[PDB]
Design an enzyme around this catalytic site. Structure first.
Site, PDB file in Angstrom:
ATOM      1  N   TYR A 146       0.859  -1.197  -0.079  1.00  0.00           N
ATOM      2  CA  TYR A 146       0.002  -0.057   0.006  1.00  0.00           C
ATOM      3  C   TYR A 146       0.712   1.245   0.104  1.00  0.00           C
ATOM      4  O   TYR A 146       1.769   1.206   0.602  1.00  0.00           O
ATOM      5  CB  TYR A 146      -0.861  -0.108   1.306  1.00  0.00           C
ATOM      6  CG  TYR A 146      -2.152  -0.780   1.375  1.00  0.00           C
ATOM      7  CD1 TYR A 146      -3.298  -0.309   0.825  1.00  0.00           C
ATOM      8  CD2 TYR A 146      -2.038  -2.057   1.889  1.00  0.00           C
ATOM      9  CE1 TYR A 146      -4.631  -0.968   0.830  1.00  0.00           C
ATOM     10  CE2 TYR A 146      -3.144  -2.787   2.047  1.00  0.00           C
ATOM     11  CZ  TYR A 146      -4.532  -2.355   1.437  1.00  0.00           C
ATOM     12  OH  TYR A 146      -5.761  -2.966   1.439  1.00  0.00           O
TER      13      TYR A 146
ATOM     14  N   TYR B   9      -1.737  -9.776   1.503  1.00  0.00           N
ATOM     15  CA  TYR B   9      -0.534  -9.339   2.413  1.00  0.00           C
ATOM     16  C   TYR B   9      -0.729  -9.792   3.547  1.00  0.00           C
ATOM     17  O   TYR B   9      -1.736 -10.152   4.293  1.00  0.00           O
ATOM     18  CB  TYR B   9      -0.221  -7.853   2.100  1.00  0.00           C
ATOM     19  CG  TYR B   9      -1.473  -7.231   2.515  1.00  0.00           C
ATOM     20  CD1 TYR B   9      -1.758  -6.750   3.798  1.00  0.00           C
ATOM     21  CD2 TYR B   9      -2.494  -6.825   1.548  1.00  0.00           C
ATOM     22  CE1 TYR B   9      -3.023  -6.269   4.205  1.00  0.00           C
ATOM     23  CE2 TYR B   9      -3.615  -6.002   2.016  1.00  0.00           C
ATOM     24  CZ  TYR B   9      -3.807  -5.836   3.337  1.00  0.00           C
ATOM     25  OH  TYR B   9      -5.210  -5.240   3.592  1.00  0.00           O
TER      26      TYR B   9
ATOM     27  N   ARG C 225      -4.060 -11.668   4.503  1.00  0.00           N
ATOM     28  CA  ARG C 225      -5.302 -11.040   3.984  1.00  0.00           C
ATOM     29  C   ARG C 225      -5.629 -11.770   2.601  1.00  0.00           C
ATOM     30  O   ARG C 225      -4.570 -11.514   1.678  1.00  0.00           O
ATOM     31  CB  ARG C 225      -5.497  -9.532   3.923  1.00  0.00           C
ATOM     32  CG  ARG C 225      -5.343  -8.724   5.256  1.00  0.00           C
ATOM     33  CD  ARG C 225      -6.601  -8.856   6.281  1.00  0.00           C
ATOM     34  NE  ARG C 225      -8.003  -9.228   5.653  1.00  0.00           N
ATOM     35  CZ  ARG C 225      -8.755  -8.488   4.874  1.00  0.00           C
ATOM     36  NH1 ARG C 225      -8.491  -7.301   4.672  1.00  0.00           N
ATOM     37  NH2 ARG C 225      -9.906  -8.902   4.501  1.00  0.00           N
TER      38      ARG C 225
ATOM     39  N   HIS D  14      -7.870  -8.037  -1.818  1.00  0.00           N
ATOM     40  CA  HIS D  14      -9.166  -7.302  -1.400  1.00  0.00           C
ATOM     41  C   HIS D  14      -9.008  -5.810  -2.114  1.00  0.00           C
ATOM     42  O   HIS D  14      -8.029  -5.059  -2.208  1.00  0.00           O
ATOM     43  CB  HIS D  14      -9.815  -7.336  -0.275  1.00  0.00           C
ATOM     44  CG  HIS D  14      -8.702  -6.523   0.594  1.00  0.00           C
ATOM     45  ND1 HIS D  14      -7.508  -7.630   1.222  1.00  0.00           N
ATOM     46  CD2 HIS D  14      -8.510  -5.298   0.997  1.00  0.00           C
ATOM     47  CE1 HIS D  14      -6.850  -6.540   1.950  1.00  0.00           C
ATOM     48  NE2 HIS D  14      -7.434  -5.388   1.991  1.00  0.00           N
TER      49      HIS D  14
ATOM     50  N   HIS E 113     -11.108  -2.001  -1.087  1.00  0.00           N
ATOM     51  CA  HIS E 113     -11.778  -1.558   0.208  1.00  0.00           C
ATOM     52  C   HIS E 113     -12.841  -0.577  -0.858  1.00  0.00           C
ATOM     53  O   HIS E 113     -12.605  -0.031  -1.739  1.00  0.00           O
ATOM     54  CB  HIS E 113     -10.925  -0.654   1.057  1.00  0.00           C
ATOM     55  CG  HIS E 113      -9.985  -1.471   1.780  1.00  0.00           C
ATOM     56  ND1 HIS E 113     -10.191  -1.768   3.008  1.00  0.00           N
ATOM     57  CD2 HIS E 113      -8.786  -1.651   1.540  1.00  0.00           C
ATOM     58  CE1 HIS E 113      -9.079  -2.581   3.530  1.00  0.00           C
ATOM     59  NE2 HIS E 113      -8.285  -2.430   2.539  1.00  0.00           N
TER      60      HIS E 113
HETATM   61  O1  LIG Z   1      -4.587  -4.499  10.564  1.00  0.00           O
HETATM   62  C1  LIG Z   1      -3.747  -4.732   9.289  1.00  0.00           C
HETATM   63  O2  LIG Z   1      -2.546  -4.565   9.178  1.00  0.00           O
HETATM   64  C2  LIG Z   1      -4.301  -5.680   8.555  1.00  0.00           C
HETATM   65  C3  LIG Z   1      -5.422  -5.182   7.591  1.00  0.00           C
HETATM   66  C4  LIG Z   1      -7.051  -5.337   7.765  1.00  0.00           C
HETATM   67  C5  LIG Z   1      -7.972  -4.830   7.121  1.00  0.00           C
HETATM   68  C6  LIG Z   1      -7.753  -3.989   6.033  1.00  0.00           C
HETATM   69  C7  LIG Z   1      -6.296  -3.630   5.602  1.00  0.00           C
HETATM   70  O3  LIG Z   1      -5.981  -3.014   4.762  1.00  0.00           O
HETATM   71  C8  LIG Z   1      -5.085  -4.253   6.450  1.00  0.00           C
HETATM   72 FE   LIG Z   2      -6.407  -3.577   3.246  1.00  0.00          FE
END
Ligand SMILES: O=C(O)Cc1cccc(O)c1
Ligand SMILES: [Fe+3]
Ligand SMILES: O=C(O)Cc1cccc(O)c1
Ligand SMILES: O=C(O)Cc1cccc(O)c1
Ligand SMILES: O=C(O)Cc1cccc(O)c1
Ligand SMILES: [Fe+3]
Ligand SMILES: [Fe+3]
Lengths: 233, 200, 233, 200, 233, 200, 200
Positions: free
Chosen positions: E105, E144, E154, E157, E159
């Site tokens: 990211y 990631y 994860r 995905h 957002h």
């Molecule tokens: O808490 C985290 O680092 C993992 C996470 C959890 C949910 C969305 C994200 O982008 C990242």
């Molecule tokens: Fe995320």
């Protein structure tokens, strides 16, 4: 002039019948051996003729009157033309041809012994309305023997030709009648590998569309390739 | 994945296609207006030409019950979609092969140039659809002209054909019929010199 | 020199894809029309190269270092090479090649619009250990379009080449990734008739072999023709 | 019956095989040690020869993306499995066809005679495996020499080919290249003069 | 100004993930211990911002162009926004953010070892059309690792943030990709107790919307709370 | 009973919410127009105030990755829905907590009074939605003003809160920052002095 | 995905753990060789220290039936795995809390420094595992020393704990017992000042 503003959903060549289907004899010598070359859609492929201005006659769609009355099962053949997305296809050309009640076609080449009907031609055409609806009035065709295997018989069927919005959508098919025991035996019907695809070709008895003490009716809906707008091209 | 409604399956036109789409050929009375093989009226701009061909099967035999549909731009490279017998030029036509000689004919004009989706010019071509008994699903092809070598060599479409020898199958041979400019476009469905057929 | 002491289980040609698989366009012109001639196994066929003494570079098997860091999902691809009898195949040659994260190949002929990755080559080689294990470190390749049907896409895949004990066992295949929705639509995958055969090409997510906060891992075991001793010959 | 674990299914090598197995040809930097088309160093015992050929498809068109692997005995008719770039002669090699000319080449020595399982001598031959996009599972063949007629006549392998006319497809034609002894071995995958391919 | 003329169907808090879901470690201290206090809908809750007049940049929704070309799987993400009654939600704000092809990211706090992509930012926004449709052009993000359990990953995905007609309908969620083997292992995904609910979060491969030889497409429809007229109030 | 389509399930905004909804805070370049923390321009009618606060977890630790959304009436107690940067006042805004200080701030005016559905007046309030990693579904609350005690005592919404002590959690404390009227509103997600959260 | 055989599930040690692992404490006769609370013989190199502490439940009440296991490097920062009663130093030991007082004691030396996998040195620490009735699966923790502030500050492990306040729970407060160097390390299973517990 026509404009390139649409894209058509790619045909499923495993859904449609294949070219080489040996049980249907003539296909042997009439099917390419080289693979088809795929090309990107262009204006050339995404456009086609609009038949809105063709001068149709009053009984173009009425086989009972367009050729006394023909002898045979008076029926109405109606349905709707839609695309894969379920959108109606308005003002599109629907053409049909068939044999008489005894299975005899009004064509030079037809030598079947069932006689011709003096009040029957066997041709109709109808332009779809705003909702994609078409309708025809005719007689139910009879099955007919053909030189394939030694005892081959075509199930009763009506030939259909549909233009759609482009040459990309144009289609020729055949309609079969609900319950016809000949269906599952036909090498031509069998050219189609998916039984689910076969069901799509079967017109259903439509009592709600019938004319009491007059004629029966069959429902036959046609699905053309889905039309979508270009994006990020 | 996402699945839409399935398209209605194709079926062969059969040997009697003529009664529905080529009345005269079926040997039946025609209606007031018919879609036939004369795309252009004498008074239509462009170079008037005659197109003619024969269709062959895998055995080298003539396919005498064939039915063909054509789609082409006008002399100005424009597609005229509003079909009307009053028009001096119609982009769409129909033709069939004689049960006798097995030859089809079309009266039109040489099409103007049109660009593909990426803005690249395509050589003058005519879009053809072939139908017949023995053909489950109609066959797509293009007719190009031998006197357009230059344009041809640059066509984004012709260039999609891997083997150059294959491209030659789409080139019509300029000739003359009664001292009139004609082009001959024979189609070989199967075998030696088999014509390139497209999917789109 | 090499000794003719072994026999290899006959290949199951209904298991492997056939030569002529029409939906895979290029196969049409590149498949023999005459039947293959069966020949008895001889020293010619039951021997093959041993690559124990090839001079492998230190990062031969690490696509992350052998070409900055490439862009993409960092994964370990590991497994075991065994024979049909479940016997491990030690010190055998495993070669692999694949596209980048976007499905672009570092090859002259690749004109796909996905860009090259300045830090990615896409080639690896590994000699299996005493237990038949191999491993590679790379990035997960992207699917890619190809001129077959008008809208064909290969699933993400890694190309594999395994030598085995003889030229009779040598094989070239492709590894696919668990859950990839493109799998069932691929004409190349579909060159294989038995779905059970298809399963064999799918690498399974292997959380157990992963490096937390670093990279995931996929498991891919390969089975070569069973090797047996000659008897009563 | 008894059923073992099934063998991993083959897949086409695809168009980009060169990147993984013919780096130089993929037009990519090579590694310190590569498996290539020079089986014998100039100081290798035996008759030094040059092998060359083209690969044709069923249309008679050149297959410019083929990948080939060879296995052969040394001049004494011995198989040398210990692969080493230091060795004067290696029994294993790789070659590929030019994206241009479509011809592969190999630098080796004429193999010595080897006996079959039953103790009968086979004529001098080179085992070949062909790979390429369009090929689902690789094709196995054998290259025999035209100057070994006497030996060829008695090959138990060659004799397994039912039709004598087909045996000829396996015989390389002796020539010279820059005054060097060369044999030309063309492979026809399909159609007229289709090369025999084996199953073992 | 806005007016109180609508009621929104009450939220099913057993359908949505609960506040305390201990496998997702951070929720332990960030979840209320007292019950939520229910209150009737007023103009305060049944109204919200209309973004029709926000000045959107020409590539606001094209992540391929809005930050060279990014490295990764080129995809279109499209769908429709509708309410529980199945009515389209026109001119509504759809915002999205994601990682690059490697799971990296573009944020100060992201220390994952996969490199950043010089041509990629990872943010898009799009106003739905008259029919409730939206689309984005981007590259498929990579999974990631994160500090939850010792080996948590994860699934890939994107957002999403959706405004809807009021603050009552505003929602934030995540889109997952069809077939991803990681899905079932995710503690965040498992914050949702009903499997049927998880299925609503999975984008489906959409070959029909893909650009042949260019990019694939995923379909993701979003359902906001049903909007009805007040009655006998 | 009757069931409609299920609403799309919520998911946590995650730790990187800023990249998508608070560009500046993610520390990335911004676009031409951004939805931020300044609801009123200097020339907007009403009393200009500064709002600031901190967010605490169940351990009494600062939540430095929070993201907030605010909805309020203008000084005339009217909701301005047509969002526009040109406007003197926007009813909708966004804010977030510093990765460091962990304090958010908003620039607006004190909202006028609105009536509930029954036609009863509500005390001046700001509708708040809190988002962050660790929060599966966003938390709804209201910000009331300590200098509006009279109005507060009659609030039909404030009155639904059973225990009076819980009501206090919703009252921002009037202060001054650079001699500017400011109100501090701390949110305690969990435990002792846990802020009231609503369902609607 | 790949699934391995599942690990045997944990179960609480129960109230009578002593009879099996702390015989003296169960108040039963011991065996020739027992694993106990004296890691170092007087003659062991390094700073000899005394460790002591108490264990508290969520109610702040003493857990008098606890069982502890310890693992630490020697003064040289070395792990001595070959357990032997003869060794001057053993890296492993066991202790328990008095059913009375509820305190445990250990006799060892201050551990040397060791590096994490990345090659970064960790502050001197003792790894501890806690067992007792009411604990389904044992709790893992680390004991660090107050007099190593510098090292503590740089520990890659301690640094993994988000909130600094929580890190302090891991630091033993140095004292002296009978003028002997001692460190007190109290564990709070639950609640106010709950000790950090690890997963690995
Ligand atoms: O808490 C985290 O680092 C993992 C996470 C959890 C949910 C969305 C994200 O982008 C990242
Ligand atoms: Fe995320
Ligand atoms: O070839 C035939 O005689 C049989 C046939 C086949 C298909 C449609 C028809 O109208 C007739
Ligand atoms: O022929 C092709 O372009 C498609 C393809 C097929 C098999 C493997 C590949 O790498 C690529
Ligand atoms: O607490 C108890 O008395 C019951 C118990 C629980 C577990 C193991 C035991 O030996 C005994
Ligand atoms: Fe018929
Ligand atoms: Fe590939």
């Amino acid at each position: 002039p026509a404009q390139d503003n649409s894209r058509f959903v790619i045909r499923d060549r495993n859904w449609h019948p294949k070219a080489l289907t040996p049980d249907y004899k003539t296909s042997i010598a009439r099917s390419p051996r080289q693979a088809l070359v795929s090309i990107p859609q262009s204006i050339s492929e995404t456009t086609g003729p609009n038949f809105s201005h063709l001068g149709f006659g009053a009984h173009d769609h009425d086989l009972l009157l367009n050729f006394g009355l023909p002898i045979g099962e008076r029926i109405i053949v109606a349905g709707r033309v839609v695309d894969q997305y379920g959108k109606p296809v308005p003002n599109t050309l629907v053409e049909m041809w068939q044999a008489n009640a005894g299975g005899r076609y009004r064509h030079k080449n037809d030598r079947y012994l069932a006689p011709l009907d003096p009040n029957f031609g066997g041709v109709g055409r109808c332009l779809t309305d705003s909702d994609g609806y078409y309708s025809f009035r005719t007689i139910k065709p009879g099955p007919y023997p053909w030189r394939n295997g030694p005892n081959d018989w075509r199930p009763a069927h009506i030939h259909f030709g549909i233009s759609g919005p482009s040459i990309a959508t144009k289609l020729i098919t055949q309609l079969y009648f609900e319950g016809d025991p000949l269906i599952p035996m036909c090498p031509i019907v069998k050219s189609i590998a998916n039984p689910e695809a076969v069901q799509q070709l079967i017109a259903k008895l439509d009592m709600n569309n019938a004319n009491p003490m007059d004629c029966l009716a069959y429902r036959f809906d046609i699905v053309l390739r889905g039309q979508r707008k270009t994006h990020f091209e | 994945p996402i699945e839409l409604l399935p398209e209605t399956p194709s079926q062969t036109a059969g040997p009697y296609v003529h009664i529905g789409l080529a009345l005269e050929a079926a040997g039946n009375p025609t209606r007031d207006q018919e879609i036939w093989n004369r795309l252009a009226k004498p008074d239509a701009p462009g170079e008037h030409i005659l197109l003619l061909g024969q269709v062959y099967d895998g055995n080298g035999h003539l396919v005498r019950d064939s039915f063909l549909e054509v789609w082409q731009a006008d002399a100005n490279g424009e597609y005229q979609d509003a079909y009307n017998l009053e028009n001096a030029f119609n982009s769409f036509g129909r033709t069939a092969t004689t049960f006798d000689a097995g030859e089809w004919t079309l009266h039109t004009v040489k099409p103007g140039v049109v660009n593909n989706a990426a803005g690249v010019p395509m050589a003058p071509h005519i879009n053809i659809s072939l139908f017949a008994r023995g053909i489950n699903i109609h066959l797509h092809t293009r007719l190009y002209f031998d006197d357009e070598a230059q344009a041809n060599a640059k066509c984004p479409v012709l260039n999609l054909i891997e083997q150059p020898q294959r491209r030659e199958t789409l080139i019509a041979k300029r000739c003359e019929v009664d001292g009139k400019t004609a082009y001959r476009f024979d189609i070989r469905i199967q075998g030696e010199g088999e014509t390139v057929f497209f999917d789109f």
